[PDB]
């Protein structure tokens, strides 16, 4: 309306009121969520401080819900004109940055706390120097000290050393800096809560040092502290400050307004646990009760914050209503029945154990103490009971830090144990925990020579000397093995081996008995035989303790120990290391009887590879392991099927003795599918490796083929989609064989088999049936052209047809264009039968199951609907309907010109990795998913491929908003600038669309250009990312609620693409699923250093972001905000080496596919991949230097280093020797050079690998089809 009003400036005046009035309106309405919606009205309004006059809790307090950032919303875009450059503008507002700070304080969580922990502490250029530091604590998840030591001096000096940087320190740095410091143990209790709580405020008449405001600038923020502080205090007993002082000043702040007061304290209900109120307990839990009535009623967009918050909440709560209510009726019976029972105690501690978040994981043992207390004091109205309940309370906490892997509060609790139990096993548990606590130090690199002896100081001297023998002498002798894992492992370096500091002397001393000179060679002996010594100390108790208690432990353990030391001997040559190294694996493999009751996929992936390279044990490997999936459920093999399917085919000389055994065992144990793959697999090479081998295995082939008859029925049943790749790919394989030597016979020979089987005889009736309706129509008359010159070619097998195929291809494609008519194919495809109910042969659901135990196909793929469409592609893959047997519905996609046993492996890792997402709680705390897929590889060039919906390229919405905003249909893509950067390309390198990324000089100018161009190109499409992101995004808070998991993608993504290189992604190839509402990568066309090492396609980038990306991702500094996320990827990664070790290990160890046949693949699509493939992999290891380069590549990265090795061996200077040096570039980028550490790089590795990509220098190089330029 103010639009029609020429009056505008005065409208501004109107706003002034509007705003202000609404800011009061904040300042006045409270405990009112419908105004939570109002704040959102307010951000929907159009102005800047339109909000800002709303500070954070001013939006609303401890609960605004996630309207929380929404003010922040306009903040960055428009309110912020200053910070939008991603760096502090001293003229920017503490009322701009800060309000985010304070607000996300109630987003306090891993990511948020990581977010703000430095976040606009970039927005303060003062904060940086100490702030970036102390971030690590919360990154280490330090609620205790390592910060308090790290940052405490910042405000604590009153910035003595700090202020001298420059006049800015200001207040929010100090505000946040302080409230920072205290809030840590404010969650973590202990005395720093009392100490720092004191550091906040006088505890000298708080009540109105509290009521001191109706607008806390802070003060409500300290509000919890001392009433928080009580808790460590409430541990022992009663009679302190907050007891009466707060009990009353809530009888006065009570007289202020009751609700939100309550909402801030059931600290109110908390203290009660001391004084045994039968009454204010009653009503004031009722207040906790109506309270979370508010909570869940106040919430939407269901989230850990929306929830886990409320979860810890209701947990502790009704834990109390327990506690109370049986203080209420504990008298009613008898007197006291729990005197005879108390196991209400069991009923209390068992029911809620310790989930991922550790706030709760304290809150519990708090409550517990408060109860076991009341127990023993109500024992009067016996103690072996409640004491036993103390052991109870403690142990779960103990081991459940052993999950949390967190140092400080642990030993807080370990000392707490030495106090608490003081038993014979008080220690032994203190021990076991301390032991793991090392491995929590072993987690990081810091503590190099240190923690190792530190607790290893305490090793066998006092441990089992405290036992009875004593089941779980298992778990301790184990703990040893843990140790020598550490003491061993600190040499991936010779870190210890080069460090004889003070102790390491003593280490070598004990070493022979359980300097660096003996540690040098003979530590590994000491480590080894005190480990395995502990293994025979532990072996019977592995069987004794509990199902999957210690067997998995000791056994997977020493297994790992070995295979690691194997990897050593893969690198280094020690004959005796091979002697016991190859003596031992005999033991650990067999455990799958005991073992193989969990995934332990280490075991399963190792075991084949063992013989695969080497077998010293003729039947042993065959005896017991042959008993494996023979014995253990049919399903138990499935995860490594791909292995066997080539392994049994091309690899195995031991097939008949072993693999043939189990597989032929597991068909009658209901394995059915292996046909398809084998169908595919045994398709290429029938195994000529050995006589007997091919004989009995080929026998297997024949045995299992029957009933795979109907598979084959799916085979021919899919000549789908369009032959046009049958033809063209025939031109490519055939015409490709024209570059060979003599012996052209087999070459085009099988190509003929499957040509005049597939195509050249379309009307051939046998073909005709399996010929499709597309072929029935247009796959004939031009196939008459093709059968003639193709009959000559059928007669010749000489290279001339390279030109004739030039004709042929042009012919064979150009007359194939109009078809793909979609339910022409489908009714032809409407065979699929279902008579004698498909003749009584049970069928997968199309590749049923991911490798979790017992047959995961109880379903039959059954019918199909003719509904299908292709994504326009080089594939044009048909997306077809799988209609269900058991009343399931399963449509999917197809890949017919290509067949992927490689991306098989690809997910075959993914499943592992997110397997580790499981291994870490905090991953769950980040809700770390996996995009997956599936494939039904029946034969050589093709297999069915899974499909999933609501899923379309980001590029889509990007564009529709692009064009239909930018003019109408144009996008912006016909801008001059794109073709103009192409012009600079042509000026500094060749003229053509293939190369001209060759020459590539002027690295400073490289930066110059790619900046200049890049930015004027790329800003508006960011508005589209956020924008169509909006037309997706229903509610304002839903927006970034979305980019939670969206970013979660781009992170986990970029991780994967370091795990191996990116291809099969333009920018589009990641595609939103609307329910998660975020793109996924399903697309994998490339890996490792080969692809990038292609002179056509050099790519240094460890991943691909773009300008618009980071823009969307925020006016942040998502640098951090996804950075440390990446870290968690790594802190994950550093958990167990052997995982991916085996993964990529046997992974690249196996294939003849992934190189020459993947040469064939890159062929099968990649254009400049044309000659690259063959003349590339020749005389070169995708294997063993890739073996090591990848194995190290795990460990640390001085800047994409082993790639630089690869492309280094590659050619030539102008692209490479130029940029790999120019990867190191100006003091602009010089960080990228100097920052790296060959010795150790991790959170680093992140740091660089992130904006390695940011480098316009790196950017304008890579390629256009990836459009960082756009």
Curated annotation (Swiss-Prot):
Residues 1061-1069 are annotated as: Catalytic loop. Belongs to the PI3/PI4-kinase family. DNA-PK is a heterotrimer of PRKDC and the Ku dimer (composed of XRCC6/Ku70 and XRCC5/Ku86). Formation of this complex may be promoted by interaction with ILF3. Component of the core long-range non-homologous end joining (NHEJ) complex (also named DNA-PK complex) composed of PRKDC, LIG4, XRCC4, XRCC6/Ku70, XRCC5/Ku86 and NHEJ1/XLF. Additional component of the NHEJ complex includes PAXX. Following autophosphorylation, PRKDC dissociates from DNA. Interacts with DNA-PKcs-interacting protein (KIP) with the region upstream the kinase domain. This is DNA-dependent protein kinase catalytic subunit. Changing residue 716 to V: In IMD26; shows impaired function in response to irradiation and a less severe defect in V(D)J end-joining suggesting that the missense mutation retained some functional capacity; consistent with a loss of function mutation. The modification Phosphoserine is found at residues 873, 963, 1168. Residues 1081-1106 are annotated as: Activation loop.
């Amino acid at each position: 309306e103010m639009d029609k009003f020429k009056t505008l400036s005065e409208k501004n005046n109107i706003t002034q009121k509007l705003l202000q009035d609404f800011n009061r309106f904040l300042n006045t309405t409270f405990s009112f969520f419908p105004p939570f919606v109002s704040c959102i009205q307010d951000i929907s309004c159009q102005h800047a401080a339109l909000l800002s006059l709303d500070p954070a809790a001013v939006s609303a307090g401890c609960l605004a819900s996630l309207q929380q950032p929404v003010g922040i919303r306009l903040l960055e875009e428009a309110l912020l004109r200053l910070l939008p450059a991603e760096l502090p503008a001293k003229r920017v507002r503490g009322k701009a940055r800060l309000p985010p700070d304070v607000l996300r304080w109630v987003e306090l969580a891993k990511l948020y706390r990581s977010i703000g922990e430095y976040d606009v502490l970039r927005g303060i250029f003062t904060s940086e120097i100490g702030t970036k530091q102390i971030t690590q604590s919360a990154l280490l998840a330090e609620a205790r000290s390592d910060y308090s030591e790290a940052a405490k001096q910042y405000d604590e000096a009153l910035n003595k050393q700090d202020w001298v940087d420059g006049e800015p320190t200001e207040a929010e740095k100090d505000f946040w800096e302080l409230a920072s410091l205290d809030c840590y143990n404010h969650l973590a209790e202990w005395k720093s809560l009392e100490y720092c709580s004191t550091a906040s405020i006088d505890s000298e008449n708080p009540p109105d040092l509290n009521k001191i405001w109706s607008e806390p600038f802070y003060q409500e923020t300290y509000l919890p502290y001392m009433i928080r502080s009580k808790l460590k205090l409430l541990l022992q007993g009663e009679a302190d400050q907050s007891l009466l002082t707060f009990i009353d000043k809530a009888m006065h702040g009570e007289l202020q307004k009751a609700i939100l007061e309550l909402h801030y304290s059931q600290e109110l209900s908390l203290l009660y646990l001391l004084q045994d109120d039968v009454d204010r307990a009653k009503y004031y839990i009722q207040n906790g009760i109506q309270s979370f009535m508010q909570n869940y009623s106040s919430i939407d967009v269901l989230l850990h914050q929306s929830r886990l918050t409320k979860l810890q909440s209701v947990q502790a709560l009704t834990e109390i209503q327990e506690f109370i209510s049986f203080i209420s009726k504990q008298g009613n019976l008898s007197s006291q029945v729990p005197l005879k029972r108390l196991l209400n105690t069991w009923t209390n501690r068992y029911p809620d154990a310790k989930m991922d978040p550790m706030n709760i994981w304290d809150d519990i043992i708090t409550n517990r103490c408060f109860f076991l207390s009341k127990i023993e004091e109500k024992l009067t109205p016996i103690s072996s009971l409640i004491r036993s309940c103390k052991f109870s309370m403690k142990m779960k906490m103990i081991d459940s830090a052993r999950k949390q892997n967190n140092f400080s509060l642990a030993m807080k609790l370990l000392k707490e144990l030495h106090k608490e139990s003081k038993t014979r096993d008080d220690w032994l548990v203190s021990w076991v925990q301390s032991y793991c606590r090392l491995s929590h130090c072993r987690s990081r690199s810091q503590g190099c020579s240190e923690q190792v002896l530190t607790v290893l100081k305490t090793v066998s001297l006092l441990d089992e000397n405290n036992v009875s023998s004593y089941l779980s002498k298992n778990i301790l002798a184990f703990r040893d093995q843990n140790i020598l894992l550490g003491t061993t492992y600190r040499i991936i370096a010779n870190a210890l081996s080069s460090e004889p500091a003070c102790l390491a002397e003593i280490e070598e001393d004990k070493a022979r008995r359980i300097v660096i000179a003996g540690l040098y060679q003979r530590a590994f002996q000491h480590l080894s035989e005190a480990v395995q010594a502990a293994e025979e100390e532990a072996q019977p108790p592995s069987w004794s303790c509990g199902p999957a208690a210690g067997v998995i432990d000791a056994y997977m353990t020493l297994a790992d120990f070995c295979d690691q030391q194997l990897r050593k001997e893969e690198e280094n040559a020690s004959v005796i290391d091979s002697a016991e190294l190859q003596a031992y694996p005999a033991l650990v493999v067999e455990k799958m009887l005991k073992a193989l009751k969990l995934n332990s996929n280490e075991a399963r992936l190792k075991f084949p590879r063992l013989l695969q390279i080497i077998e010293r044990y003729p039947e042993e490997t065959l005896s017991l392991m042959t008993k494996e999936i023979s014995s253990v459920p049919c399903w138990q093999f499935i995860s490594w099927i791909s292995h066997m399917v080539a392994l049994l085919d091309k690899d195995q000389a031991v097939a008949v003795q072993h693999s043939v055994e189990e597989i032929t065992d597991n068909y009658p144990q209901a394995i059915v599918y292996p046909f398809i793959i084998s169908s595919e697999s045994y398709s290429f090479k029938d195994t000529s490796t050995g006589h007997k081998n091919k004989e009995f295995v080929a026998r297997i082939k024949s045995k299992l083929d029957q009933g795979g008859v109907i598979q084959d029925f799916i085979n021919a049943l899919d000549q789908l989609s369009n032959p046009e790749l049958l033809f063209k790919d025939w031109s490519n394989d055939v015409r490709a064989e024209l570059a060979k030597t003599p012996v052209n016979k087999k070459n085009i020979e099988k190509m003929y088999e499957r040509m005049y089987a597939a195509l050249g005889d379309p009307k051939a009736p046998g073909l005709g049936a399996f010929r499709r309706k597309f072929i029935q129509t247009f796959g004939k008359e031009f196939d008459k052209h093709f059968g003639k010159g193709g009959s000559k070619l059928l007669r010749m097998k000489l290279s001339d047809f390279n030109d004739i195929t030039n004709m042929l291809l042009l012919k064979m494609n150009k007359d194939s264009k109009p078809p793909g008519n979609l339910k022409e194919c489908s009714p032809w495809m409407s065979d699929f039968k279902v008579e004698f109910l498909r003749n009584e042969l049970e069928i997968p659901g199309q590749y049923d199951g991911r490798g979790k135990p017992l047959p995961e196909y109880h379903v039959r793929i059954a019918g199909f609907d003719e509904r299908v469409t292709v994504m326009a592609s080089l594939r044009r893959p048909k997306r077809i309907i799988i209609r269900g047997h058991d009343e399931r519905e399963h449509p999917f996609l197809v890949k017919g010109g290509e067949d992927l046993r490689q991306d098989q492996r690809v997910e075959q890792l993914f499943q592992v990795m997110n397997g580790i997402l499981a291994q870490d709680s905090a991953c769950s705390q980040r809700a770390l998913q996996l995009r997956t897929y599936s494939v039904v590889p029946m034969t050589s060039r093709l297999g069915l491929i899974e499909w999933l919906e609501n899923t379309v390229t980001l590029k889509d919405l990007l564009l529709n908003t692009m064009s239909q905003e930018e003019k109408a249909a144009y996008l912006s893509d016909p801008r001059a600038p794109p073709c103009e950067y192409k012009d600079w390309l042509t000026k500094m390198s060749g003229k053509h669309d293939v190369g001209a990324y060759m020459l590539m000089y002027k690295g400073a100018n490289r930066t110059e250009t790619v900046t200049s161009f890049r930015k004027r190109e790329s800003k508006v499409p960011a508005d589209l990312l956020k924008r169509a992101f909006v037309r997706m995004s229903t509610s304002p808070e839903a927006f970034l609620a979305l980019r939670s998991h969206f970013a979660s993608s781009h992170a986990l993504i970029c991780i994967s693409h370091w795990i191996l290189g990116i291809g099969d992604r333009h920018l589009n190839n990641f595609m939103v699923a609307m329910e998660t509402g975020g793109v996924i990568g399903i697309d994998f066309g490339h890996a490792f250093g080969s692809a990038t090492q292609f002179l056509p396609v050099p790519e240094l980038m460890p991943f691909r972001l773009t300008r618009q990306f980071i823009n969307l991702m925020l006016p942040m500094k998502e640098t951090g905000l996804m950075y440390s996320i990446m870290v968690h990827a790594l802190r994950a990664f550093r958990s167990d080496p052997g995982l991916l070790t085996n993964t990529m290990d046997v992974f690249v160890k196996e294939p003849s596919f992934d190189w020459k046949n993947f040469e064939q693949k890159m062929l099968k699509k990649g254009g400049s991949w044309i000659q690259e493939i063959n003349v590339a992999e020749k005389n070169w290891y995708p294997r063993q230097k890739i073996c090591y380069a990848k194995r190290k590549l795990a460990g640390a990265n001085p800047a994409v280093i082993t790639c630089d090795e690869l492309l280094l061996g590659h050619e030539k200077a102008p692209a490479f020797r130029d940029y790999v040096a120019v990867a190191r570039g100006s003091k602009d980028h010089n960080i990228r050079a100097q920052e790296p550490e060959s010795g150790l790089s991790e959170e680093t590795q992140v740091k660089c690998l992130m904006d390695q990509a940011t480098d316009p220098n790196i950017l304008g190089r890579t390629w256009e089809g990836w459009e960082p330029w756009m």
